[PDB]
Amino acid sequence: PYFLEAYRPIRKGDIFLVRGGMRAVEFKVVETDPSPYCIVAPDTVIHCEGEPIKREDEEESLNEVGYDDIGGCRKQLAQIKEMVELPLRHPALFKAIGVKPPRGILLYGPPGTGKTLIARAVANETGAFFFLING
Amino acid sequence: NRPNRLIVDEAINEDNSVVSLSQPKMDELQLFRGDTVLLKGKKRREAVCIVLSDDTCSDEKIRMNRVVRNNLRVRLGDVISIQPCPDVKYGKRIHVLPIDDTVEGITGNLFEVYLK
Ligand SMILES: Nc1ncnc2c1ncn2[C@@H]1O[C@H](COP(=O)(O)OP(=O)(O)OP(O)(O)=S)[C@@H](O)[C@H]1O
Ligand SMILES: [Mg+2]
């Protein structure tokens, strides 16, 4: 049901994600005859045989947390992005301004509201080195 | 002994090259609001400024900026002799250099923004 009534333009060098069956699975387009890219037709044949291979050392996983896994707190997530995204994405450009950044943020709420989730998602979606300290 | 000996007071006029004196001291030295005086300080170093007038100034003191104060190797409470210098000479070539710890974020042009 993935390619049916889809006409998905694929290309050699793409990894796509299929959900269903209480499981998310990642496939990689290894070889196509119309290189590099082609639209999947009903004329196509898909040879899904072969052994599963490992991950390239630089390909990040879609199992880890991004902004999509967070729901219900759009305003606070936008406020944290406005606080933190500019001193991380542009370090040296902000260094030459003369403006002090924030240097400590305190998240609070009832237990179970997803604070570790928000911290890890803002960590991974900016490329910053994330160190964890547990009390 | 001499009426030109003065003690440093704080700065009110926020211009760098402006010193200030009181009214009867300037009337005793016969100056004007557009003159050019010279200040002698410690470690055989001097500074040239533009003298103006001030009514809130005290009797035997002088008001100057922290820039002029640090260019004379002088702190608050020291002594300075003032002398007139009518040698009005126009410059021809000015060669200046920036300091590295204050330019470590900026590059390229400095003449049009800062000095112009
Ligand atoms: N806003 C949310 N969106 C999506 N999943 C959430 C959200 N809040 C909680 N969850 C889920 O519930 C789990 C618990 O989140 P936690 O980060 O443990 O919350 P918490 O604030 O850390 O609770 P404590 O005080 O640390 S025990 C998460 O790992 C998610 O699976
Ligand atoms: Mg937690």
CATH number at A3 reads 3.10.330.10
B95 burial via Cβ count (<10 Å: 0-12, 13-18, 19+): exposed
Q: Which domain holds residue A40?
A: 1-62
Give the resolution value in Å.
3.2
Tell me what percent of chain A is helix, strand and coil, each rounded to the nearest 5. Answer: 25, 10, 65
For B62, other C-beta atoms within 10 Å of its C-beta total: 24
Residue A99 contacts B where some CB pair is shorter than 8 Å: no
Residue A21, ligand 1, Cβ within 6 A: no
3-class secondary structure per residue, A103-124? CCCCCCCCCCCCHHHHHHHHHH
User: Which residue is it, tokens 């300037």?
Assistant: B26
Residue with tokens 């002799």: B81
List the one residue out of B40, B41, B9, B3 whose CA is nearest residue B24.
Answer: B3
| CA pair distance B115, B97, nearest whole angstrom | 12
CA distance B80 to B113: 35
Dig out the tokens for B49 from the structure.
């400024």
DSSP B28: H
CA-to-CA distance for A55 and A62, rounded, in angstroms?
A: 12
Q: A65 alpha carbon to ligand 2 midpoint, in Å?
A: 15
What CA–CA distances, in Å, run from A101 to A84, B16, B78? 9, 31, 40
Please indicate whether residue A71, judged by its CB atom, sits closer than 6 Å to ligand 1: yes
